[model samples]
Target chain A: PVTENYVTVQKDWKNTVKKIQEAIKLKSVTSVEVSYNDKSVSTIDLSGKTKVSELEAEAENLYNLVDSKLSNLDDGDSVTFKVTYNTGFNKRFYSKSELEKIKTQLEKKVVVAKGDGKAAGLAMNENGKAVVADRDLVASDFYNFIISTDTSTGEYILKSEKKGAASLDALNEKYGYAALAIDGTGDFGTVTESYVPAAPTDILKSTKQIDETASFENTGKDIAAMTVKAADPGEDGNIANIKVINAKETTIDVDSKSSTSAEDLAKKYVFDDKDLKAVYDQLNEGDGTTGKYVEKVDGRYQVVLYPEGK
Target chain B: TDIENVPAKIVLKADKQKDMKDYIDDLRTYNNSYSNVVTVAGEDRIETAIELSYKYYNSDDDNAVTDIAADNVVLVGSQAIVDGLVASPLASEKHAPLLLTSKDKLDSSVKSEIKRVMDLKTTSGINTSKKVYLAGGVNSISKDVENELKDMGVKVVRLAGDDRYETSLAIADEVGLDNDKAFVVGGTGLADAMSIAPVASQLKDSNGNMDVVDGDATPIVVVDGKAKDINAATEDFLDNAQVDIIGGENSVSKDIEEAIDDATGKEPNRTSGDDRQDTNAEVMKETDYFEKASVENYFVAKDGSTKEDQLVDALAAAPVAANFGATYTKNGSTYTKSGNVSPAPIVLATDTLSGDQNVGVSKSVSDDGGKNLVQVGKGIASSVISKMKDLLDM
Candidate 1:
């Protein structure tokens, strides 16, 4: 009888440990119960601290006990041994607050250059144990550490990660990571050396020399043509040299008053005194001095006349 | 304005007699002389009235009856004074004449006049259908008179009613009561009505067409003095009507005036005097006809003391007055202006006057101091003929 029971239970426990280990990785099993022929023998509360090794050993011990009980059974009888596991996360798992502290430590090593205060391209999975940051996150490569919070409560969540020296260099360049090293509270390794991003300096442009002498022409018509001369500036104390080169000839003729005859002068400017007097009389009436008289003054005949008074 | 070329000569007895004969012959010839007294004659007053109608009808044109046919003639009983008095304006509206008839028979002269009016109308190429309004009921003017008028080819329209009051209303209806102004008189007596006949005859329509030979005459509403009120028909007729009451309180009682006011919703204007002649004078004065220079002609009755004579004279003179442009007072209460410049023939209702005496009266009143008179009835025929001979200078 014991041999028959032992055979049946042995077959059932063949892959049980491998299955438990797989369940633990999935965090699905909450508690485990062992039974033999409908009678509960032992219960392992997965809600408490539970390990895959411990669960494996417990399943083995329960199998042995059920094997011993089966040896006393008859050949026609059988021991019905069973193992049951409740599904869900284990009780030993960290709470969201505890997980958030770990994530916060990792995030503290990194500094975002620019982001919206609430999201900043970082998000967490529904369980709050997984974190991710989008590629659009500001200084995304600089942040080797990633963290997220509960969206509704605004509390920190445990979603986090960490990276290497390349991300550390970006973080140091963006946030002066030397200060973070001084505090020494983050999960990031000790930063012996840090660098602050420096403002870019202006570049100096090269200068080119200009020629002193060049041909120049004023192309405007309807204006006087101008001649130009090239000369070297002398020293301050020396006099500037000016030389006269062209000697051209020209003539000017002026006619004098002596060339004009007396008759011509009289015909051009002088009037007959008698005729002028008659005209004056006609205009002047008897009111004042009436006629015009001509007398020679300084070789020219200058007339002094009086108008008639009415 | 001067009497010139006075030829002073002594009269010989033989020459005076010759002159008298010549005047008589001239009168007989019906000449156009200022001294002539043209008489319209017949055997009695009815005859005289008819003859007078014909005379006026023929005065302007002997052959043309258009004037008379285009007109309305008032045919009253010889004794129907109130009807005659009321009928004057109706006659005057048509510029018509008044013909009188006996109560039982048509007077011969009246028949002759009707026939003559129709004949003249036919000859003148007019409608020849004249309206001969009989101014009394069958009792006052029997059907015999209507038959006589019908036989003469004149349309006989009888304006008659059950009594004098109704008869007056009927006459008023015939004359048309749509006038803005109306005359109110006592139906029981003819004195007041007769007194106002001439003045009322001058009432005109809005178109300035007076009640002359045409039918558009001002209505004469007669109230009963004994009843001291107007009949319902007369009252209704006077509704919103402007009424001018003829005569004093004695003639058309104060009660009648009040009834008129009650019925018409307006006060009745009263024109009255102490007697018939006085009333006539008062009516004339009230109308300001004399003052306004509107009395074109005077129809002198042989006797105003009798209602018949007054009726005949008033009817006779209405057309003369209307045709000569006598204007009515506002509200149609009286007449104004001696309307026309032409000499207004003085129509005399006398039947016993001789030709000389008729001529003498006419001459006495004329501005030219010559006879200008037309006599009618039995008394004045020979006188008119003699006057006509004198006018013709025969």
Candidate 2:
């Protein structure tokens, strides 16, 4: 019965070990695919001698760009890049003569670099004073790219156990110690695609116009119309008889003549058509004749007019 | 005025006028009321009417002599006449005199007789006391009489009021009897042709009223609206009557006149309105006029005028901040003289001209130089001028 109670193992230990070793090998492939996702680099034409501060600024710019790009990659990815000079490899002693010189050096060093813009290709250099080559780095791409880890203790080896190990042997033997690894995809060397064109150094500001200007003039058309003219001219070149005048009716004679006076006769001057026309003709002139004026009642040339028409 | 209204002067010997002549006549009729009662043996009849008359007149009978000697008809018993006694005679005499007579007189004849008897009565040194009569109508006679009476050891007094200056002789004579010494008959009126009998009758028949007798000796007068003695008067009389005499030996008291003048600035005339109708009114009018003029003229002219112009000039001349300009700078130091006026100016100018720009004016006081400076512009200075204008107008 005890013999019958004994449990038998169904799975093979060797097989499990073989599968884990294959996964580990798959994670540690040697042909590391290093590619930059949308890599950007600006080349400034600093043919003239430049300042050391310019080179430091350019290095800082490149380091920040790589840091930002690598931060967007997978956690274990690696980055490789090269920095090269266009000309004049031998230069030293950086100082400013004026603000313009300093500004020019700053622009050449930092702003025209591998940061904040589209990247461009240039002729490769190798085995020279400055060269463009693969960097093959890790988090150091964003920080100090110089690997200054302590080899004796492997203190800065990125693994917690290795941080206090006396040697790589000790780190390799430690349970939690692991070598600094990358995604190992090797496609990191390729560049991603972009939509907008690259921007130039000199940028244009916004226009101040409220609206756009038009080509042809537009005006409202088709209204109403009317015209008028002067009827005639008065004797003294005054426009006269322009208005239509109405006639006064005749009065009925019902009383005797003894009850009336010259003043009453003046008030009762019932103007006929002709007299009305004559008054209208005089009023149209806009002359002083329409107002209180005395005239000489001579029959010959009775219409003789004066300046004041006394 | 004229001296025609004054009386003529009369002269007489001291002896003639020394004795109260009118008083001597009064004593004759004053004693006539008593009749002679002869005691022949036993029951001699003394007229009861005569005794009653004597008693009514306050007269005594002890000194009344009834014994008729061979030398005298109406001899007074005892030395009462010489002793300067004034009481009436007592009763109980053996024979009573029919009439009384004054033995005191200034006449040499009567004086000599009195002297003879007086000498005989005192042998070694006759201390014969005799009454002396005083004459009236003397202006300063009262002082002499008082002094002389005191020397004689006799007290004398004036009759009150007008009775002391009456013309009746009987009252004076009765008061001057041998039994009554030192009678003062103030003589104001006496006619030479008139007989003494009527005077004697008037005095004796005066119903024993002393006031009637004294009224004839002295007259009453109102001084300072109060009754006063026209004859001799005492200080007590003046005080009791509340009177002051204008011109007399007494006149007005010096202290009283001074006090009244000091208080009211005038003397109390002591006359009623009936005596001095317009005197009080005139004095009051003059006092009022003087007081008004004096008060109004004090410190300046009396014409009333407003002091506003002087006040304005004074205020204008006084130093004030508003008199200086708004703000000024001198020697790198700035000074400002601003107030809460309308349309306030921005002290700090931010623009050359404001939106609604108008001509502005800025004024300032230069503290170091003590001068005011003004600036005209179209920005904050204009606003300052507008505000300054409002303040100035107000």
Candidate 3:
């Protein structure tokens, strides 16, 4: 249910040696800078006890002094750190990835991209058929599209990348499926309580880990050979501690003992990244731009949106 | 996330003054038409529905002065209390008075009340086409009563589904979303329904205007219990807008309240108190409901209104609150609104108080820690409070 932010994740690896040295936090340190709240990087002064060998002893003391006022926050808040040394080296606590995920999660914008929530011609919580037909939409009309589902009832809906729900497995539980589709399209399918009034019985169902990086590329084969490892899934269809082996696997937990292949089992436990990408590709291609376009994020009907260039 | 409330101002106007003229009168025996507090003191729930219809619509074979101009009447089964409570909002929505009948047969007096209201002079004039709405499945109201209403030559429409929860949704579907809001109460609970009846019955506009053509009335949606599953349609209906729960955790549970908040994207404002009658007082104390009042009626209940058959308390008291918005005049004193002259109900938990239960009165504004209460047979004090606390120390 909880995971740590990506550590040692930063770009521009050339400066990484100096950055790692800056993080050494000895007498060579110029100033300790913190960019919590993910905004302006502010600096804090250190005490006299400074040496490469002496850093570890009081560095945690400084970390504690800084942390005493770090102020742990709820969803609407986030924090990151960057240490600046005298030689102009900066070591960051997290890359850009962790902050956006945290910020989006706070605003309940699990489907949204990293941008201010402003956009062109707002539309949400309306019927898909009416929305698609009512406006002059285009392939680039939206910034991005997302497929979000409710775990309580296996339903799917297409929304703007900016219009995400707190219900997605990415933000909370991986029991449900989520796909942050690329680009926009003039062609998309309609949606109801689910992808349709009801999910169709026979179709290749593809799902992926909203967990950023869970290595679920061959999730279908894994789940098939992945025997039930725990007791009856009592909550949200989650089965704990199973070892997957076929021609190969290891001890891993799957979001769903829920299933894959048929889209109607609501059987979307397999993480076929290509199939999900294909699912988005399938939604993006249609006969016309009428039912092929989703007018808004939430509606009386559900629609799956795919990519135009895909 | 708007609460859709009107707290702060305290206006508990009286239907009749507290001069102590003659105490032995009311819609109590189903004879009297209007009073401050009238218990529809009937022998059974069968008589209970009859007394309710008689109190507001008919008395002594004639239309009561407070009768709504009804082109339609709603009929639910005798035993379906949830249907009756849910139907209360529909009654307000249609201006159709609600009457209960036995599934086996229809009473002649209830029929007369229905016939009399069909031709009553309404603001939109009289109905050229009459209709009767039968709520609940055949197991509730039965087809025989349906045939009787149809034989009267008026159009009959049955709004029902597999069970009481579905039937409640059917009526709400018939009522429409109204003000984009609905009332949610414990499906099995009684007093919560009686508490919300007056507020739910009257139409309210988006701008807080009451009973205007521009305004719309809402419906009563029931959440059967913590154990009962909320069907797809019911979930869809609740997710549509603001939901206000009428009872505490004991009646509606925090579990149901949280799920509805997640669905509707708004946390429901729950009103609950120590016990049933106090919960009734707490519901009335809601600022939005209280400030919207133009006439106030008191129903001093029997043994604090929880008898062996509790449905009578819910059924009988509902109409007086439902009918409070009707316009009427006796002498120069009219029920039409003036500034601070509003309509509301303050529950009087029986005159003969015998135990530790608070006498269940509306929270009056006071520094005495709820001291300046409206004594029985007295006018309600002009100010009120924002919270429901203490038993008011009896």
lDDT of 3 by residue, B1-394 (tens): 1011111111111122221111111101111111111234466656666666665653332223243344667887776665655776676556556777887788876776676666543344334467888888888887888898776667889988877777778888887885678888776566666667767766677766764223467788877666544557778887658888888787787777777877788878877777775676565556777532322333334322534234434444454454443432233533332122123454534433323223233233222232111222222221221111233321
User: For residues A31-71, could you state the per-residue lDDT of candidate 2 as single tens digits?
Assistant: 11112422324432223313333334433443444444443
lDDT of each: 0.45, 0.21, 0.44
Residue A274 alpha-carbon offset, candidate 3, angstroms: 84
- Candidate 1, A1-310: lDDT as tens digits: 0111111222333344444444443333444454444456665554543444454555455446545554454322333322233321212222345445543443343332222223322222212221232222222233322335334423222321223667655544323222221222322223222332222121101111111121111111111111112222222211111111111111111123334232332322322334343433333344222333222334332323211110
User: In candidate 2, which residue ranges exceed 4 Å CA deviation?
Assistant: A1-310, B1-108, B116-130, B136-394
Local accuracy of candidate 2 as per-residue lDDT tens digits, B1-394? 1111111111111122112122222222222211111111111112221222232111223221111111111112111211111111111110111111122322233233333322323334323333333222232134543354345342333322233223123123333322111111112101100111111111111232212112121112222212232222322222222222222223333454444344334343431111111221221123211121111000000000122111111111111111111111123333221222111111112122222211112121111111111221112234433343332221
* lDDT (Cα, tens digit) per residue for candidate 1, span B92-136: 665567777789977666666766654544455435445778888
Comparing 2 and 3 on TM-score, the stronger one: 3
Cα miss at A296, model 2 (Å)? 99
i-RMS, every candidate?
Answer: 70.5, 71.8, 31.4
Candidate 1 Cα errors over 4 Å, as ranges: A1-310, B1-43, B61-72, B120-128, B151-154, B207-215, B288-290, B293-296, B306-310, B325-394
Off by over 4 Å in 3: A1-310, B1-44, B58-69, B120-128, B212-214, B227-229, B291-296, B302-308, B323-325, B328-341, B346-394
Candidate 3 local Cα displacement, residue A178, angstroms: 99
Show the lowest summed lDDT stretch of 10 residues, model 3 chain B: B1-10
Individual DockQ of the candidates? 0.00, 0.00, 0.00
